[PDB]
Amino acid sequence: ITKLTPTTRVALRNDSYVLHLVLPSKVDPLVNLMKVEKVPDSTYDMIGGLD
Amino acid sequence: RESIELPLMNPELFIRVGIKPPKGVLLYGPPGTGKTLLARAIASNIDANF
Amino acid sequence: HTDCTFIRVSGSELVQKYIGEGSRMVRELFVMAREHAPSIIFMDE
Amino acid sequence: GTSADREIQRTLMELLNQLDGFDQLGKVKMIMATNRPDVLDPALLRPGRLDRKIEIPLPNEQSRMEILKIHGAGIAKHGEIDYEAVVKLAEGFNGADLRNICTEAGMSAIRAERDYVIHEDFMKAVRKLNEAKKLESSATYSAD
Amino acid sequence: RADILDPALMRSGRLDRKIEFPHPTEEARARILQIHSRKMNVHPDVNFEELAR
Amino acid sequence: GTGKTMLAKAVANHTTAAFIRVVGSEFVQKYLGEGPRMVRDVFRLAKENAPAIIFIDEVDAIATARFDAQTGADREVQRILMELLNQMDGFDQTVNVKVIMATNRADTLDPALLRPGRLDRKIEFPLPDRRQKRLVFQVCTAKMNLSDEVDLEDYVSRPDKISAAEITAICQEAGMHAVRKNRYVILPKDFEKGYRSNVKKPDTDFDFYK
């Protein structure tokens, strides 16, 4: 039960809707928001004239 | 008539002119002008193709 | 160079579907940040 | 502003697209009518959607007389109906207004049970109509 | 309020006869008292016209 | 009114790629939520077919600015817009796929769709005034007769702030007037009946301001 992370996906039987197996990696909402943002990842060595 | 039925009459005439036939004409008229009657009458050209 | 959670928002509405149903207050983003402590907040003009 | 304006605007755009959107509806043209040409979307007035604008104005004196004659078919009257006097009286009347005057002619004739229609019945109906429309707005149109 | 009324709403075909009802001035002012007091019981010591004025 | 899809359909002609120019209003199918699945199918078929280019017309129709997350009908539309957001970012940079979306008013532009890396094309369409208005008029009048005396620049030089379809509208209107007049060539006068007929704007600019 503890391994079953709340707000996470686990398998569900059909005739019984009983637990069948966990679901590995369904989704992270913050990651989706960031991907929608499409931030321009940079590098400190690529900083221009603002040492 | 030249707006709608003239095109179906001989669009080749307009083509020879050099322009495409009229696409769509909208009727402008102050309220209570009775433009709707104009269309009701224009319905007297096909009566099945309107 | 700092390894922080970057989140820059322009006050759109599509992202609102992930913060909350209504987003009554601006605490919605904090909830996403609140569990990702290694985060930074950026806001455009 | 609204949650239908989204859907309403989408419907408007879909009609716009289907008008001349990567396809021409040939052998068929569409004619639309609207009282307020100023609340028309800027796109609908473009040459691709609106081809030409034919404006129908309020009837002229000759136009008013022609309309009265058209509506003056089933009137049981006496040979003194001076439509010219009424026509000169009918100033700035709307197109349906002439039919309203013709109808009110009978209503006045229905009063007193006068089977025939006298030239005075129209003369009073025109006066009544001219006074009824005092509460109008008087804003014809703007084709922009 | 006929002013707020849309111009189309008054276009002959939609509405033909426009009847405006004003307030009773002096005589209908007493007729209203006679009617609305049809069942009211009052001794003959009230001047309907006087109250109307 | 720059011939909205004019340049786009032009690209569709001289191009060697397959075209998918969809109207941004057809995305809301009847069935619930099926719209997002179709939208994904758009990009799927585009990538699958060939080194082709598609068009998403009336982008604002699916590209909104604010959503009403209570109307339901707005929820599926916003999701399909997120559907397109995923699809556009669903490119591997290896597919010869590029579908051009088009909206007439950029004011109500969903920043998620135009976010950096999503769309790098910024091409406005100013109204031709003198440089193009001459070229535009020359092109439009090409299939006209204009028998002997109709001076083309004669009406171009007028200020006559116009629109790319406005030149075409004036041309057609002169054509229609001649048709009513049965002039097998465009008489230089009919240009007058056209230019003033199509530029019928009640500006009523007071000369007091000068």
Q: DSSP for F110-148, please give it.
A: -TTTSSTTT-------PPP-SHHHHHHHHHHGGGS---S
Sheet of F53-57: strand order equals F19-23, F53-57, F100-101
DSSP bridge partners of D53: B26
In which residue are the tokens 């009137």 written? D75
- Torsion over CA of F168, F170, F171 and F176, rounded to 10 degrees? 120
Chain E hits for D100, Cβ within 8 Å = 12, 16
Q: Is C40 helix (H, G, I), strand (E, B) or coil?
A: strand
Among the listed residues D28, E34, A41, F131, the one whose alpha carbon sits nearest the alpha carbon of residue C8:
A41
**Helix A29-37 × helix C27-34 angle, to 10°:** 110
Distance from CA of C27 to the nearest CA of A (A): 14
Distance CA F103, CA F56 (A): 9
Among the listed residues D144, D63, D142, the one whose alpha carbon sits nearest the alpha carbon of residue D97:
D63
Instruction: Tell me, yes or no, if E16 comes closer than 8 A to chain D by beta carbon.
Output: yes
The reported resolution of this PDB entry, expressed in Å, is 3.3
Whether F contacts A, i.e. 3 or more CB pairs less than 8 A apart, is: yes
Chain F hits for A35, Cβ within 8 Å = 89
Whether B contacts A, i.e. 3 or more CB pairs less than 8 A apart, is: no
User: Exposure pattern of D43-56 as b/e (b: 16+ CB <10 Å)?
Assistant: bbbbbbbbbbbebb
Contacts (Cβ under 8 Å, ≥6 apart) of D59: D66, D67, D93, D94, D95, D98
- Contact, D126 vs D90, CB < 8 A? yes
Contacts (Cβ under 8 Å, ≥6 apart) of D76: D115, D116, D117
Q: In 10 A of CB D93, how many CB atoms?
A: 24
C-alpha pair distances (Å), B6 with each of B22, D30, D60, D66, F176: 9, 14, 26, 26, 11
Distance CA A45, CA B36 (A): 73
Distance CA B1, CA D122 (A): 34
DSSP E8-38: TTSSSSS-------PPP-SHHHHHHHHHHTS
E26 is written with which tokens?
């002096």
Contacts (Cβ under 8 Å, ≥6 apart) of C8: A37, A39, C42, C43, C44
Please, which residues 5-44 of chain C have a Cβ atom closer than 8 Å to chain A?
5-9, 14-15, 18-19, 32, 36
- Contact, B43 vs B50, CB < 8 A? yes
Output DSSP code: residue A46: G
DSSP F174-203: HHHHHHHHT-SS--TTHHHHHHHHHT----
Among the listed residues F24, F29, F33, the one whose alpha carbon sits nearest the alpha carbon of residue F99:
F24
Chain D hits for B25, Cβ within 8 Å = 29, 31, 50-54
Distance from CA of B20 to the nearest CA of F (A): 7
User: Exposure pattern of F54-74 as b/e (b: 16+ CB <10 Å)?
Assistant: bbbbbbbbbbbeebbbebeeb
Say whether F175 and B18 touch across the interface (CB within 8 A). yes
What is the H or E stretch that residue C8 is in?
Answer: strand C5-9
Output DSSP code: residue F208: T
φ and ψ at residue D48, rounded to 5 degrees: -75, -35
Distance CA F128, CA F125 (A): 9
- Contact, D20 vs B23, CB < 8 A? yes
**Helix D61-71 × helix D95-110 angle, to 10°:** 50
Distance CA E17, CA E19 (A): 6
Residue in chain F lying closest to D42 (CA): F1
F88 is written with which tokens?
């556009």
Q: Is F1 helix (H, G, I), strand (E, B) or coil?
A: coil
- Torsion over CA of F196, F198, F199 and F201, rounded to 10 degrees? 110
Contacts (Cβ under 8 Å, ≥6 apart) of F184: B16, B17, F145
**Helix F73-88 × helix F34-49 angle, to 10°:** 20
Percent composition of chain F: helix, strand, coil (DSSP 3-state, to 5): 45, 5, 50
**Helix F190-198 × helix F164-181 angle, to 10°:** 140
DSSP chain D: --HHHHHHHHHHHHHHHHHHSSS--TT--EEEEES-TTSS-TTTTSTTT--EEEE-----HHHHHHHHHHH-SS--B-TT--HHHHHHH--S--HHHHHHHHHHHHHHHHGGG-SSB-HHHHHHHHHHHHHHGGG---------
D135 is written with which tokens?
């509460």
Say whether D34 and B27 touch across the interface (CB within 8 A). yes
In which residue are the tokens 């240009």 written? F191
Residue type, C43: M
The dihedral through the CA atoms of D96, D99, D105, D107 has a sign that is: negative
- Contact, D47 vs F199, CB < 8 A? no
What is the H or E stretch that residue F105 is in?
Answer: none
Experimental method: cryo-EM
Say whether B14 and F175 touch across the interface (CB within 8 A). yes
Vertex F146 angle, CA F141 and F150, to 5°: 100
Q: Is F24 exposed, middle or buried (0-12, 13-18, 19+ CB in 10 A)?
A: buried
Say whether B2 and F175 touch across the interface (CB within 8 A). no
Whether C contacts E, i.e. 3 or more CB pairs less than 8 A apart, is: no
Largest Cα–Cα distance in chain C?
Answer: 35
Instruction: Tell me, yes or no, if A33 comes closer than 8 A to chain C by beta carbon.
Output: yes
Output DSSP code: residue A22: E
Say whether B25 and D49 touch across the interface (CB within 8 A). no
Distance of CA B7 to the CA centre of its chain: 8
Distance CA A28, CA D115 (A): 87
Say whether A35 and F89 touch across the interface (CB within 8 A). yes
**Helix D3-20 × helix F73-88 angle, to 10°:** 60
Distance CA F61, CA F102 (A): 10
Instruction: Tell me, yes or no, if B31 comes closer than 8 A to chain E by beta carbon.
Output: yes
E24 is written with which tokens?
């009773």
